Write a protein that binds this DNA or RNA. Sequence first.
DNA 1: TCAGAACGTCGTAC
DNA 2: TCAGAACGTCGTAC
DNA 3: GACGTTCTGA
DNA 4: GACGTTCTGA
Lengths: 157, 158
Amino acid sequence: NFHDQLKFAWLAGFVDADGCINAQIVSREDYLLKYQVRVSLTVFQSTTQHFILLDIQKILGCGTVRKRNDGMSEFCVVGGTSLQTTLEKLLPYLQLKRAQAKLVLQIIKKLPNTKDPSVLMEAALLADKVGLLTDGKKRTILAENVRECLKKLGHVV
Amino acid sequence: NFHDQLKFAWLAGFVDADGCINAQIVSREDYLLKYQVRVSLTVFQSTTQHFILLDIQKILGCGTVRKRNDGMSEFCVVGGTSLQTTLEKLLPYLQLKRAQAKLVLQIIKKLPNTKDPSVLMEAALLADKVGLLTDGKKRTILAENVRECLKKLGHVVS
DNA sequence: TCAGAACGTCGTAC
DNA sequence: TCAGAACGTCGTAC
DNA sequence: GACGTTCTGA
DNA sequence: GACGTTCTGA
Ligand SMILES: [Mn+2]
Ligand SMILES: [Mn+2]
Ligand SMILES: [Mn+2]
């Protein structure tokens, strides 16, 4: 479709401006390795224009829409399966966050093998590099925290 | 052609998200009617990605790029001639600010006749309606201020 | 007299 | 054990 | 925008 | 994001 491509180009613009493509290290207490590398695309817009997020969901065919308790609404695609598809669709039109996407795509390749501490460690190191591209200030959970935990768990990386 | 349409669709997204399509009432002390109705599209981005605003300028073929003194940069197209061409390219793809664009396009029609006080008043009333679509809290120059000034100046309007 | 170029900063929607 | 769905809020880039 | 956290269930 | 103001020149 030249029509679907018109949609994605518009969405890339929106994402480039009011979106977030991210990899984070999230604490998971019942993981044997204690950490997940979570990947996501998020789109933010005031709840006053909530509908646009649903329109984005319709365009992509996946993802969730929620309302935050502060007047904001969010669209999120989280997880390797749905996200890889989403990013491949936007990849040709992204101008500001293409690096974030290329990196996340590198992480998604490793995700099915994150039970191996070495692979997890690589995913985590890649997450850190995505953090360096975002506006974020509160990034506390880092690759070093994974490496110190893994070592404490008796693993070798 | 289609490549251009992809560029415009993307720009519309970027405008829908981090842009501003607006109409304002600006005081002009040396105007006969004391006021102008200024129409504009603006794109905002941190100076860290200053390059993208230059990219937009290249895409549209007009408009200015400046750096503000707070780490922000802006791309701006101000004025009827450049703006109308600009809005018409984005208009099919705008999804959040199409109303602002359509209203500004109504205002652009009137601008070559804003020497007439009643036409200025129409554009000023229309600008007021664009201000209702924006997120601004700071707008203090409204249609009512033009109406009172024009009356003071000896003109007849309503 | 016009009016864009360029500017400086508040409030909140990212 | 996994990990998305849904959530709550800080700092600033709109 | 971009984090960290809690809920839910495969 | 979206204002109101100052510089510049047609
Ligand atoms: Mn932005
Ligand atoms: Mn926005
Ligand atoms: Mn924004």
